[PDB]
Design an enzyme around this catalytic site. Sequence first.
Site: not given
Lengths: 299, 299
Positions: A41, A142, A144
Amino acid sequence: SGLRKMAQPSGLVEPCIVRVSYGNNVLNGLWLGDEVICPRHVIASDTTRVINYENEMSSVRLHNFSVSKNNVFLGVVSAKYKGVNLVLKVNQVNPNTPEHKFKSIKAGESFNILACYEGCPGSVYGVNMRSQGTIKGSFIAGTCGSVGYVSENATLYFVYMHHLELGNGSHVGSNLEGEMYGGYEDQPSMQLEGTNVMSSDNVVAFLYAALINGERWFVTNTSMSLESYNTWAKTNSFTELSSTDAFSMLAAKTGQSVEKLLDSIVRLNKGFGGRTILSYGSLCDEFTPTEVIRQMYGV
Amino acid sequence: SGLRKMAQPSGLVEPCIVRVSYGNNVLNGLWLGDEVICPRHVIASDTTRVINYENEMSSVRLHNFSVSKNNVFLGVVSAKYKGVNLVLKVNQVNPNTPEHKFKSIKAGESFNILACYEGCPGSVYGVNMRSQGTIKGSFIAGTCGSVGYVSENATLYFVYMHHLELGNGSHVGSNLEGEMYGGYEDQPSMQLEGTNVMSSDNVVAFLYAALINGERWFVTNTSMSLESYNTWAKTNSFTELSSTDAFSMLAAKTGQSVEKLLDSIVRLNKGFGGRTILSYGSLCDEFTPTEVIRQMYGV
Ligand SMILES: *C(=O)[C@H](C[C@@H]1CCNC1=O)NC(=O)[C@H](CC(C)C)NC(=O)[C@@H](NC(=O)C(F)(F)F)C(C)(C)C
Ligand SMILES: *C(=O)[C@H](C[C@@H]1CCNC1=O)NC(=O)[C@H](CC(C)C)NC(=O)[C@@H](NC(=O)C(F)(F)F)C(C)(C)C
């Protein structure tokens, strides 16, 4: 004495964390060899609305990635999806790649999170996988691509990469082959967790830790047989205990059999009556038997 | 979202840990340059009886030390007390000595423990200094010399070396200058910790963290003035709060004033009544305001 939820030391994992950004999205990746794995993503134009990952891949440009370790940037020469992860080929081999394997974690097993913020390892802490494939961690925007790992046999396994947080605050990641734990989708859509089932093995280990640490108010002159406990567990969202064999040393050191603690679980699941166990106010299933034994007695 | 007690990553500290034994005693040393620092009771012939450290130093024989790390054996060329620590000059310089400083921790401050088991770094976890100079960790035989550290502005500080456990389970260590936190002696004597004074700032931060995480059952529209709270706190083993300015951002993001939480503290002090807050069953003062902010919002 004492009981604290531990992380295994992070030194081998830290040199593998990179910052990956695309558009206005920033997260972390795992740099091994000449490959960087990160959540796919990062390339989504808008992570707050349903994502067509085929269209995002169709419109991707390699020159739109930024990949970097400590403010030194790497050239991206290939990008592929592998499940819910991107696999990026970069123009440099990580010279600090540790010997490692990939493995998937099962319900009730413990592992370590290296929580990273925009490419920088920030903190390390232990977690335990829940029945529905979630963990209760601490992840914000921030973080992931933060990496879960476990070391066993002196073999380092990478086991988790962080993707999302459910509406109830549970945390969802994938293994490093890009299969999402729990089958969740990497989509900003309402997905429900499902009933949490407590690990009976871990709750017994916890009560043994409590006994070792001088907490024993929950033990009485009552003992519940294994089959009786397993019948109760089936309708009270606890796992069934296959045998009491894992606890033999703990039973011997504390003088309390597992069946005494199975009766405690049944009584304590009703409520603690305002008391605490090692400063917990409800049963804790985040420690495994081997975790407790190692922490209380050494390797 | 989420709140866990975390540790800063351990990669710079791990290569400094060595195994130090003398006679029957085995613990950990911190190897920096050509020096190994370790608790001095490693040369006590009997740690279970009162120790005459003058006699022990006079009888010491350097050939009785074993200092090792992986396949490296380190010869001791000289041994000196520095407060309650031994400083061993060894016959090889640590090639992985990180840039570092030494400083002391004050009550209410958080830091990291690298728990080391007879020379082997095993786990890493976060702690908070108690009012009487102790911490609540997890230490067993073989873990003395385990190292506490903190990193601020990319500067690595060594701040703690583990020595002993009081009868109430509190853990006692020294700074790296060999001054014992809290003033306790490195003797097997009756040493009482004294009354624990909870850090009011930290408990406030803890409750803000909960609010941020969607837990709010413990706040009412009733408030308590800073002056009335401080008077209660003097009589009930809480620190006095100097001002509410540390929490201006937290109050803004949550819409709850420090004074609303001060009244929560007084009501919660008798216990959580069968409820929990961020999976703690009683009030927790182990998180500083800064700690909570950086974990829940980033730097
Ligand atoms: C990493 O990029 C973040 C990590 C999130 C941020 C807050 N805590 C976390 O663990 N991941 C996301 O923003 C993720 C991106 C999707 C494309 C997978 N979205 C979410 O986690 C959202 N969750 C949902 O929409 C939910 F699961 F349906 F609840 C939120 C609303 C941003 C948490
Ligand atoms: C490291 O060598 C151990 C670490 C201890 C072991 C259990 N938990 C710990 O933190 N330190 C000691 O054995 C230490 C040696 C003395 C010479 C300083 N002794 C103790 O910690 C004892 N504590 C006391 O005698 C007390 F503080 F007075 F209570 C025990 C009884 C071994 C814990």
